[PDB]
Amino acid sequence: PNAIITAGALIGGGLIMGGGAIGAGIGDGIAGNALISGIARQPEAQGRLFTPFFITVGLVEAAYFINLAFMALFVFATPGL
Amino acid sequence: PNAIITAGALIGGGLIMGGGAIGAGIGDGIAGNALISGIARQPEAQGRLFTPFFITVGLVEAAYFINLAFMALFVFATPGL
Amino acid sequence: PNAIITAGALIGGGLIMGGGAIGAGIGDGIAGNALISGIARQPEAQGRLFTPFFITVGLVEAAYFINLAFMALFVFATPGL
Amino acid sequence: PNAIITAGALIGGGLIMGGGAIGAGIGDGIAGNALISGIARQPEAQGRLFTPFFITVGLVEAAYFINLAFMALFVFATPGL
Amino acid sequence: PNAIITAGALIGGGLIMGGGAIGAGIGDGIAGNALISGIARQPEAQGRLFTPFFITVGLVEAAYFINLAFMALFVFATPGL
Amino acid sequence: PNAIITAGALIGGGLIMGGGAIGAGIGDGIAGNALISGIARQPEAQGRLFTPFFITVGLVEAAYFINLAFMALFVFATPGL
Amino acid sequence: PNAIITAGALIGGGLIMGGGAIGAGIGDGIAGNALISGIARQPEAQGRLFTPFFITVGLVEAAYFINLAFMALFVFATPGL
Amino acid sequence: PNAIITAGALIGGGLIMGGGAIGAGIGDGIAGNALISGIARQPEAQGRLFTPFFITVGLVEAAYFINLAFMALFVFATPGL
Amino acid sequence: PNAIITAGALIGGGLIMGGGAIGAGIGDGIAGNALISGIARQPEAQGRLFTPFFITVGLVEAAYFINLAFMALFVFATPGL
Amino acid sequence: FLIPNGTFFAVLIIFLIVLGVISKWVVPPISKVL
Amino acid sequence: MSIFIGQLIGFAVIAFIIVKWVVPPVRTLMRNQQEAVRAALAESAEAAKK
Amino acid sequence: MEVEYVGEYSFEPDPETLFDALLPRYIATRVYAALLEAAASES
Amino acid sequence: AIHVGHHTLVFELFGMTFNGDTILATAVTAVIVIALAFYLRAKVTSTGVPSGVQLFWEALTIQMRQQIEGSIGMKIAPFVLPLSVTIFVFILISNWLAVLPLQYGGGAAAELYKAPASDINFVLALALFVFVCYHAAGIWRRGIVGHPIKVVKGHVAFLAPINIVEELAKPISLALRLFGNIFAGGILVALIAMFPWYIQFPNAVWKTFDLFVGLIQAFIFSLLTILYFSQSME
Amino acid sequence: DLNVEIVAVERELWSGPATFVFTRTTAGEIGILPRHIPLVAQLVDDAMVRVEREGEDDLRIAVDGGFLSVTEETVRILVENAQFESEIDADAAKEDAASDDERTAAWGRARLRALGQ
Ligand SMILES: O=c1c(NCc2ccccn2)c(-c2ccc(N3CCOCC3)cc2)c1=O
């Protein structure tokens, strides 16, 4: 009984982390694209672009962290186990 | 019977959170790309731009958080259990 | 029988809802990118870009919410049994 | 036998709906990005850009709505029962 | 045994249509983004822009419809049944 | 035994064509977006752009059709079995 | 025992060719987008653009064909029997 | 019971790495696209763009390698075994 | 028991390479888009654009080969077997 | 594998030693040279 | 031994690659930088002498 | 040149580089107009 | 089959377990770095043509100073220069040393020198030292009362929950990015060891990536350390 | 329909109606039909222009460092110096296109593009 629940929890946590990594990596790359383009256009922008950038990064990685948290709730803890 | 339903609920919640995180991360990165590009091109529009930004993020995160709401319902309430 | 059907319904509903989340998040991010960029280039367009925006979002949200409905039809109701 | 086929049909319909929703949301967002950018650039272009837009959406949403019908076929009146 | 084969065929057809819908929606949205952008930039070129458009669509939709055809083979013919 | 192998082959072929459809649709949409943007820019260039456009479409469709042939191998000539 | 291993290997190979086709199609479309755009802006640039193109395509197609080889492994020489 | 959990952990870790690799590859490609475009526009950018670029990569790789760490936990130290 | 673990390892490795192929192909295509566009804009920049390119590729390909590693771990050295 | 142990300190000290040698006999001489 | 021989051949191949394609450029850079240092020294020399 | 505000468009490749390339052209045009005005006045 | 962990020379002292192989690899890279430092001292000159090690040290210090000055001038953070440089070489020499032909057959594959970054202890030591150091710098510059306040506040106040987590993420990722990059490699080169010698070309291809990726990881680790200092020091 | 005003600092060159106008801006090739979005662009130093209108042949212009402005009715092409196809000399342009001076070489290449190749 608990074996099936544990396997399902592992698969669910893998899905959580895979989706979180896709979202975080792609969103961070997209935001860094704007950051790099802005710094290339204006080197002084180096200073001011990290504030909009690190807001984005953080919002983008929120979903990664919350997902991560619930994955810790899936494999270590396990609802219904 | 409960073991199979619990494994299915865990897998479904994992799919929900993976998709939600993919959408959230990628959409937040895309919106922050526009924010960063606009702030680089027009430094004085920072405050002008955080309104349409946090709106769009607010939409994207909404899509995420609804999904999270459901995931709990999947793993803790588990309809059909 | 109901155990397997319910597990399959949970997995299917998770797929529905996660796909809707991916689509909604990414589409909202893409539309918000255009909104933010246009507002950056045009302070006044703030008023007039909310009409093309909320229409696009209206579509992007629509596909999302429909999924939600069907997801409920998958999990709360069960078409099979 | 019927339970296994029902679970498979639910999973397949969920995959159909997830794919349809991803396509619909992302395509609608991409089309609305062009619509918003054009209406920001030229504000009088609105009436001109709703014909190219609703065509694209008409295609995009079409792919979505087809997936609905087949989903129903998968979910209601499951083939091969 | 057919039960297992039929469930696998339903899942496979669902995957086929999910992928076809994702591709169709996203490609149609991308092509319509170019169509809208061009018709915004060059209002008088609609006729010269729709031929490349319906060609592009004619490609992506083909990929969709071909997939749809094979879905039927999976769902109604079930070659391995 | 075959029923399990047949179901696995059907799911594998479903993934095969789902990925083929996603790749084909999105790549063809991107290539057609480039073609339409180029023709709007320079409406007299329609003839010139078909060669790079058809080369790109040929590469994408070669990938798609090699994948559709491998689905055919999976389904009608399932390896092993 | 062998049937389950073969079904799992077929599902794995279907996932590998599906991901490979997604990557190949989308990357080839993205590269051909740049090729078509550059040849639209610079009609004479074709000569110099097919070298960076076939290089990048050479990478992308490589990622495809590698997968193809390994998928044959999975399905013809399936390890772990 | 351990065999089921091991198979589930392998599938979960495979999902973790699939998502991590998708995110890493796509985000790194986007960041490198920004870097290459910026260096093409303004050659001396070579000097200043490797700072924001390797930050973006540093953000893109994190979500990948963290997943990889959680893969090792899934595969070599299965939490629920 | 070893049959189930082998099937799970095969599915996990298939997911690993599917994600790795998607990431590698799409990232290589995105980087090649920038390379082709820059060499179109600046024909003499080709020599200077390879260093940013092959670095970017060197990243994404790494993420590919790391996946190629952990597939070989899953398939040929199945942990937990 | 992911659980730390005493090595965490053993490495740290060594790193600090390096951080010393570089911070005294490398960085200041190089800054003076530049 | 077989593992050792294989990894040693791989190390030899990578060493040859770096020595034939990575060593030459880096070396140049080092020489060009040295040129510079000596030159600057000597230029201070001549400026002071002059 | 001073900036005068009057009261109550797409760009290729960007408006700032176009402005940089056009200001010298504007100065050349104004110098040319001054030269023609001087020639007419001289005659 | 592949193994994870299985450290050699493991011992126990002061009630704590120590991975002898990881400590030995760290000591080897540390002594190589110290030898480079002392050879510079013995052969550092500003009045003459620079030595090779002198050129290397000048280039690394100039790069790190360029990154520092562009985010946080050395008038505020002069101490992060001797740090960012060492973190680089300590990591770089740690990774490139794994490129030596020190892999053999037990029949399980083994390596005399395994990259310290492949051990969670090494990466955690480096990352937590950086964490403590730049948090101390932030406390110094903003005060023990103001530093946590500005950390929680961040650039956007209402995003406070997304700030604190990110602050706790910085070290972990900073470690896990380094470990996962190298630990993974330790498996790849072990998997390549399953090939016969005449097929076992894959080591050349991967070794070059290991050189490339180890250089990239040293650079990224040091540059993210500099960025963390720039953020925590206002 | 379009009306194209190819104007030089010295004087105007042509202002009659047209159906299609095509030229190489610094961002790439571009073509304009009526009702085009308002635009401002710089032509490449060797830019050549082609105008097509009812009945009459293709009007090809060798343009030196011009600027293209698109207005809701007009399309104007400012030029430092522009020369019609009927006025160019092939041998002189061939000789000048190889000139060391960047401006002279660009002008010669523009004149050649006005003829072809
Ligand atoms: O690396 C670095 C990294 N994130 C990588 C990562 C870790 C775990 C999961 C996913 N991704 C960050 C980082 C640092 C600060 C930050 N903000 C500060 C301002 O307020 C908003 C938050 C956001 C991000 C790295 O530096």
UniProtKB/Swiss-Prot annotation, chain J:
Organism domain of life: Bacteria
Transmembrane segments: 2-22
GO MF: proton-transporting ATP synthase activity, rotational mechanism; proton-transporting ATPase activity, rotational mechanism
One cellular-component annotation, GO: plasma membrane
UniProt-annotated location(s): Cell membrane
Key words of the record: ATP synthesis, Cell membrane, CF(0), Hydrogen ion transport, Ion transport, Membrane, Transmembrane, Transmembrane helix, Transport
Signal peptide residue numbers: none
Entry similarity comment: Belongs to the ATPase B chain family.
Assembly: F-type ATPases have 2 components, F(1) - the catalytic core - and F(0) - the membrane proton channel. F(1) has five subunits: alpha(3), beta(3), gamma(1), delta(1), epsilon(1). F(0) has three main subunits: a(1), b(2) and c(10-14). The alpha and beta chains form an alternating ring which encloses part of the gamma chain. F(1) is attached to F(0) by a central stalk formed by the gamma and epsilon chains, while a peripheral stalk is formed by the delta and b chains.
Protein name in UniProt: ATP synthase subunit b
Organism: Mycolicibacterium smegmatis (strain ATCC 700084 / mc(2)155)
Lineage: Bacteria, Bacillati, Actinomycetota, Actinomycetes, Mycobacteriales
Gene that encodes the chain: atpF
Curated annotation (Swiss-Prot), chain K:
Location in the cell: Cell membrane
Domain of life: Bacteria
Miscellaneous comment in the UniProt entry for this protein: Binds 2-aminothiazole antibiotics, which are antitubercular agents.
Family label: In the N-terminal section; belongs to the ATPase B chain family. In the C-terminal section; belongs to the ATPase delta chain family.
Record note on quaternary structure: F-type ATPases have 2 components, F(1) - the catalytic core - and F(0) - the membrane proton channel. F(1) has five subunits: alpha(3), beta(3), gamma(1), delta(1), epsilon(1). F(0) has three main subunits: a(1), b(2) and c(10-14). The alpha and beta chains form an alternating ring which encloses part of the gamma chain. F(1) is attached to F(0) by a central stalk formed by the gamma and epsilon chains, while a peripheral stalk is formed by the delta and b chains.
Record-given protein name: ATP synthase subunit b-delta
The organism of origin for this protein: Mycolicibacterium smegmatis (strain ATCC 700084 / mc(2)155) (Mycobacterium smegmatis)
Residues that span the membrane, as ranges: 3-23
Designated gene of the protein: atpFH
From Swiss-Prot, chain L:
Name by which UniProt lists this protein: ATP synthase gamma chain
Self-association state and partner proteins as the record states: F-type ATPases have 2 components, CF(1) - the catalytic core - and CF(0) - the membrane proton channel. CF(1) has five subunits: alpha(3), beta(3), gamma(1), delta(1), epsilon(1). CF(0) has three main subunits: a, b and c.
Biological function: Produces ATP from ADP in the presence of a proton gradient across the membrane. The gamma chain is believed to be important in regulating ATPase activity and the flow of protons through the CF(0) complex.
Subcellular compartments: Cell membrane
Family: Belongs to the ATPase gamma chain family.
Curated annotation (Swiss-Prot), chain N:
Protein name: ATP synthase epsilon chain
Keywords: ATP synthesis, Cell membrane, CF(1), Hydrogen ion transport, Ion transport, Membrane, Transport
Main location: membrane
Domain of life where this protein originates: Bacteria
Complexes and interactors: F-type ATPases have 2 components, CF(1) - the catalytic core - and CF(0) - the membrane proton channel. CF(1) has five subunits: alpha(3), beta(3), gamma(1), delta(1), epsilon(1). CF(0) has three main subunits: a, b and c.
GO cellular component assignments: plasma membrane; proton-transporting ATP synthase complex
Topology term for the membrane: Peripheral membrane protein
A molecular function (GO) term: ATP binding
Subcellular location: Cell membrane
PANTHER family according to UniProt: ATP SYNTHASE DELTA/EPSILON CHAIN, ATP SYNTHASE EPSILON CHAIN, CHLOROPLASTIC
Record's function text: Produces ATP from ADP in the presence of a proton gradient across the membrane.
Lineage: Bacteria, Bacillati, Actinomycetota, Actinomycetes, Mycobacteriales
Stated family: Belongs to the ATPase epsilon chain family.
Span of the signal peptide: none
